[PDB]
Amino acid sequence: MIKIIKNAKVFSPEYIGKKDVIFYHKVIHVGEGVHEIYDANGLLLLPGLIDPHVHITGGGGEGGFETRTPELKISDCIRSGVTTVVGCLGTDGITRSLENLYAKAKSLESEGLNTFIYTGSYRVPPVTFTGSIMRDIVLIDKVIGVGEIAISDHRSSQPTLEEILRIVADIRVGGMISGKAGIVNFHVGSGKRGIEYLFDIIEKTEIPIQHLYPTHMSRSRKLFEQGLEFAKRGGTIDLTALQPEFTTIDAICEAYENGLLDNVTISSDGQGSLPKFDDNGNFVGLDVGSVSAVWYTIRKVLEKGLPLAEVLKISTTNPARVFKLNKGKIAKGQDADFILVDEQSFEIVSVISKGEFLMKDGVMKNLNFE
Amino acid sequence: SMIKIIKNAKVFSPEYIGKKDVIFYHKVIHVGEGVNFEHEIYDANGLLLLPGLIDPHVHITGGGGEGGFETRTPELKISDCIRSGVTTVVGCLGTDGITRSLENLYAKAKSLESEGLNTFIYTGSYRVPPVTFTGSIMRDIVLIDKVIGVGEIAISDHRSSQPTLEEILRIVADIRVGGMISGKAGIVNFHVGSGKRGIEYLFDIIEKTEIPIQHLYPTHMSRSRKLFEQGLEFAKRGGTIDLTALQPKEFTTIDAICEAYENGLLDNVTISSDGQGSLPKFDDVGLDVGSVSAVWYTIRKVLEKGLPLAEVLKISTTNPARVFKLNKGKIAKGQDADFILVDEQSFEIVSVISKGEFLMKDGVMKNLNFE
Amino acid sequence: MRGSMIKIIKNAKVFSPEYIGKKDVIFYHKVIHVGEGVNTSVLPFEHEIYDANGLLLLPGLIDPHVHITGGGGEGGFETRTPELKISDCIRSGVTTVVGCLGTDGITRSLENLYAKAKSLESEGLNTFIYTGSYRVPPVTFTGSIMRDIVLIDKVIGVGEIAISDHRSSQPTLEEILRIVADIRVGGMISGKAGIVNFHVGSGKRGIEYLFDIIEKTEIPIQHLYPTHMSRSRKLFEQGLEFAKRGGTIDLTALQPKDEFTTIDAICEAYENGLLDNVTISSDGQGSLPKFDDNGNFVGLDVGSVSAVWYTIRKVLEKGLPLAEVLKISTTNPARVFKLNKGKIAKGQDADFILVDEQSFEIVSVISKGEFLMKDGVMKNLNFE
Amino acid sequence: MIKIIKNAKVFSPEYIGKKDVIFYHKVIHVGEGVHEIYDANGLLLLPGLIDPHVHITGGGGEGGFETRTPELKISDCIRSGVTTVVGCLGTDGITRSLENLYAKAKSLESEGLNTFIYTGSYRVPPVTFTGSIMRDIVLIDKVIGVGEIAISDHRSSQPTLEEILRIVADIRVGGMISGKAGIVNFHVGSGKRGIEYLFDIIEKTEIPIQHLYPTHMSRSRKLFEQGLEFAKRGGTIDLTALQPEFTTIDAICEAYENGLLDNVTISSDGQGSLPKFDDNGNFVGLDVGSVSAVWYTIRKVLEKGLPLAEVLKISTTNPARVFKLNKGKIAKGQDADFILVDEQSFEIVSVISKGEFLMKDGVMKNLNFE
Ligand SMILES: CC(C)C[C@H](NC(=O)C[C@H](N)C(=O)O)C(=O)O
Ligand SMILES: CC(C)C[C@H](NC(=O)C[C@H](N)C(=O)O)C(=O)O
Ligand SMILES: CC(C)C[C@H](NC(=O)C[C@H](N)C(=O)O)C(=O)O
Ligand SMILES: CC(C)C[C@H](NC(=O)C[C@H](N)C(=O)O)C(=O)O
Ligand SMILES: [Zn+2]
Ligand SMILES: [Zn+2]
Ligand SMILES: [Zn+2]
Ligand SMILES: [Zn+2]
Ligand SMILES: [Zn+2]
Ligand SMILES: [Zn+2]
Ligand SMILES: [Zn+2]
Ligand SMILES: [Zn+2]
């Protein structure tokens, strides 16, 4: 149970230099000099990467039943070093069950991962477990908010201000009674209206800006600019990761320049559709998001000479704040979830979550259906 | 024993009426100058005789829970009610609609009534649409004898459901007509938070609809001078406002009351304990728990600014009895036999009488089912 | 303005059900004192005296089975009976009634029954109601016969459930046990009696269900209250066996216009010393129909609340002592519902009737200490 | 976080003699020779007492609204050394909410205790969170079964075999999908029918006897005899503790004699009514169960010269089995929940749960509303 990781260059979001880290399920003790032992010389110790937006049950289906994407194998997470995922439903609210989403999140947790879910889906009014999104967040311990509610998209339900305000108010007080944060995840399409509705709430109500969490905020110039204003008023935005004009990389730099990286987060959009529509509202082709798009994006920003100290924020501190999680920092009391990158190779070699090795030195623990 | 006489008391029929003997059963039979079947007597030499205090806003089941499940405050004991002189309470639900039962609040009102107290309740809670007993707020007031209105409906608070005007117009309409059918008052209690919109909605109702003002009963309105100034505007149009009673723990409710009395508006002011109700500092932190002690304490503190007792007692006896159309708050023939007895010198509650029975006799409390 | 709150009745021969001779009674809304002659012109404050020389003081009559909203309608929409007038009750010395629904549970609402009980309450009468009707499953205020008895003060049980009747829903034994279980535990929570009133037709099965429940379950017999048990003598003899196991049976009072009657039944229950186990009910504003042998409607009479005092007067004409006959309409109905009525004594609710000593007519009526009728004159009423 | 309890006479259900016990939130290491340290010489170390049947929200009300009992203060648990409680609803299913019961159990946990709940109440059909007792046990992580279903009582709903069989089958499969045990708690009244229905199930169906958990099985001679047969067929019974003819003490001995103590458990019936009814079904007087009735019962059996080794079974091993709990034994990996009794004084002095001291050496931690 009690474990050590000696003579690793410990990279708590800000650099804390060559130190040993003792840990059960949480960081128990830190101290330079000397149950399981693990030597990690040559490796960098980070806190486990956080993914706040992943279609863990699969998604897509904009082009029919054929375009229904596959469910997520934990196999892919561990190679990518993603130790905690927040599962949401997407465009399809009928064939993808909320109970199914509870279960996949419950199974991912039982095979070593850390899981939380939303209770909504694209459409307003939102699908529920118990008839009421407030009731869901008080009674289902894993529910941390609602989404992903579509706004300014062609696949939107066309929601009104008053409808939405109901939801936010219900989910917020839902939070307070239950002692959770109570987030609203906001799928933002390519409509000109953008995130107007989000400004309305904070301007015209008693609603704090912490509860509003818009995603895909990197997909255009225009929209990222709105994402920065929203940031500058004390709110946090989320950017969809880059994965094989203007990219998610340029944006994550453009936030450092204007001094706003403390308000950014990245999403894999794993197992989610990446659809291409023509001149009308017809469907042309698709791609499928990969949960290894996080670590891939991190390295392509370091490639531009940003400090690894202030890039790990987007995936470790910045997300853990948004959801009020006891994770995302290597320090006494915090939950014990780390990844280990080799020197200047820049490749994950080991992965720890809740103090159990899921990947040790490039050999994966074996899982039930692989 | 069940026909009683209080002798040699200086009586405050709210208004002062000098030294008088009161004869009562469950209601007052006679008030006259010294005179004399088995009947009990109580010599009240040295004592003042006042009406029973009325508390229009108490979370008798418990409330709060806004800081998580750890914030769940405990339920009201009647013990407090007897030592603090409160013979009548009106129970309501708060921010938690899901885990605090309406049906639980009906049962809590029934146990307290049954150990010598007087109880009424509101249906619903903070959230719009409001939780009901029977699917309909108009049905509830008609069918369940203790429901006297709806609340506390949250306007201009961060924990508000963000209600529209249209929603609130149906709600007050429904409970008003429901009030008429049942022969009760049909009050909407409004929880007013610290939002800039204040009570704009209440003004919107009287300015653009047929709905009388007597149904709109805003509470918490000594939280800022700005709100109170908008409260007084309301008072001048026939409305009644509730002030949260100062507790044993700028601009205060004591300030607030004297400002009202000096404008000749103390007839339009009441005070609530908000007992067992959460009192949290919410910043952009901490919590404390209201006591029913808060009203008699607040009465003294305003007496200490030199206001005449008979005129002050109106905020807790005459003015609540009016708003809920109750047969209480006045010592007279036909009125309900609810009295407190305070030492004239000490000014500390020594005996409390509810429905003509002694709940406390010279400091010695009646003993109850779980003490 | 209000009427003098302390009253005294002097020089009456008091039938506190049990005879207690010439006594004065001081009262407000409850009975304050029973005692020998005492100086009643010594009080310094208001007090209305009433001289009752030559009259008999008795408790207020309780009528446990009344269609206060109207009922009937077995012969089409033309056979719906009118609703009860409080002047009927005042003339008949009936100070308390318990109202129920019957055959029609489609066009007679429970909310309408709740209102009429409250309007009766407010003119000087004491009122209670049942939830449900004839049919199984039973109609409800709130969706459940348990919520109704817990949330609605005036609700004291469910009925009248139709068993051994052509108009019955043909209820199952499992259906009925669920219903009696629900209303009892409901009574326990709300501190009421939790009664199931049974409307018993003329089926061969009689009350087999009532005997099935007591013999095969822990449900005590206090909660099973069957009515119309003088219908046929076969049914009345099934009633007596029910009595000897601690039960209470209700008989429909003899009607002032028309062989084995409820008089025969009452006298047989005295003979066998089981008079503590019977009640009588007017079935006022109820259908009293005739069906031919094919099951079709022929015609009907309408029950009357005058039936109670009328029935008691017949029984007296057969030499039974007054002090023991009054049980059926005072002590016995007060038991079944756990009411603070039916006896003249310190503490008890001040519901009286006064009868002339030879005439044996009701001349004055007092409920809540208030005179509804004083010396044959009624008080002014709301819609009369 | 890491704690030791040195030179205590460690009384793992069976005696393991003077040993040190290291423990975070679970028993981490056991070893004789030598972060917080606690010396416990003179004291006996036991595993934390288990209460499988407590009306944590209050109950009673058979005699009106006046007879409604008060809610349970954690203050009383800690003095009594009761570290884990299973909350149920009783006779009243209307005024006592299931949401209220979730919350009180949630609050007791947040102030140091360990809590689980049922989803039913006396009446059949049973009240639910989500419309369906199966759905409740899959979706509400704290739900471990259904009860307390009344059988052979005057306050019974009069349930049929077929109705009940539905429930048991639904709760069982509910268990399997969710990876919980899925118990049916059975309030048994003083009816002659007794637990007949329980024999029917195992005789006439494919239903395993582990799911059937009858309570109050000590209240009569006749019924305890039925409790022993049920035991002898591989099932477990529950006895209502003794607290100030034939008692719960005689019975717990009578199980040792016939060699059946491995199939017994004790309940406080805390905050529950103990009602007295006369000749008919009317109510006379009441008493209110106390959660300190457990430890009080334990000592009055030791008074009869039974080994403390084989008496702690009823409150530690026997209950933890029934509910499939990682508790009730002092040994590596088990959750860290202990009580400390002084020499031959026989009085709790300290109480530990999840490795946090709730009572240290007779001074209680201070709690929010005391
Ligand atoms: C990458 C961009 C262009 C596509 C993206 N749409 C979705 O991701 C669809 C949704 N996740 C699903 O599962 O169906 C967008 O926000 O614009
Ligand atoms: C004047 C202040 C103290 C009013 C207000 N209090 C609450 O909202 C308490 C809530 N109604 C409950 O009891 O559940 C506040 O502090 O914001
Ligand atoms: C005694 C006989 C003739 C009348 C009785 N019918 C009813 O009581 C009708 C029902 N209660 C109603 O009015 O809706 C019966 O047939 O047994
Ligand atoms: C001790 C025995 C005699 C009484 C016991 N009844 C209950 O405990 C009632 C239930 N817990 C409640 O909360 O209402 C029994 O099983 O026989
Ligand atoms: Zn999206
Ligand atoms: Zn998406
Ligand atoms: Zn408030
Ligand atoms: Zn309040
Ligand atoms: Zn009938
Ligand atoms: Zn009838
Ligand atoms: Zn029980
Ligand atoms: Zn119990």
Numbering used by the authors:
A (entry chain D), D (entry chain D): 1 to 34, 43 to 252, 261 to 386
B (entry chain C): 0 to 35, 41 to 253, 261 to 295, 300 to 386
C (entry chain A): -3 to 254, 261 to 386
Show me the paper's own sentences about this structure.
Crystal structures of the ligand-free form of FiBAP and the ligand-bound form bound with N-carbobenzoxy-β-Asp-Leu (Cbz-β-DL) as a substrate analog were determined at resolutions of 2.6 and 2.7 Å, respectively. Cbz-β-DL-free and -bound structures belonged to I422 and P2212 space groups, with one and four subunits in the asymmetric unit, respectively. Intriguingly, the ligand-bound model included obvious electron density corresponding to loop P290–L302 between β14 and β15, which might have been stabilized upon ligand binding. Remarkably, the Cbz-β-DL-bound FiBAP structure aligned with the ligand-free model with an RMSD of 0.433 Å, despite the good superimposition of the structural elements. Such an unusually high RMSD value might be ascribed to the transformation of the missing loop (P290–L302) in the ligand-free structure into two stable antiparallel β-sheets (β14 and β15) in the ligand-bound structure. Since this stabilized loop is located next to the substrate-binding site, it might function as a gate for substrate entry and/or product release. Intriguingly, the crystal structure of FiBAP bound to Cbz-β-DL included distinct electron density only for the β-DL moiety lacking carbamazepine (Cbz) in the active site. There is no significant perturbation in the coordination of the binuclear zinc center in the Cbz-β-DL-bound FiBAP structure. However, structural comparison of the residues around the ligand-binding site reveals subtle changes of ~1 Å in the side-chain conformations of some residues (G68, E70, Y130, R163, R227, and S289) between Cbz-β-DL-free and -bound forms. Residues such as Y130, G68, and S289 are placed closer to the ligand than those in the ligand-free structure, thereby assisting coordination and stabilization, while R227 and R163 move away to provide space for ligand binding. The other surrounding residues that help to stabilize the bound Cbz-β-DL are the amino groups of main-chain residues S289 and G68, while T99 interacts with O04 and O05 atoms of the side-chain of the Asp residue of β-aspartyl leucine to stabilize the N-terminus of the dipeptide during substrate recognition.
In the present study, we functionally characterized the hyperthermophilic M38 β-aspartyl peptidase FiBAP, a protein repair enzyme involved in hydrolysis of isoAsp residue-containing peptides in F. islandicum AW-1. The overall structure of each monomer can be divided into two distinct domains; an N-terminal β-sandwich domain (M1–G56; G344–E386) and a C-terminal catalytic domain (L57–K343), that are mainly involved in dimerization and catalysis, respectively. The catalytic domain at the C-terminus of the molecule folds into a (β/α)8 triosephosphate isomerase (TIM)-barrel motif.
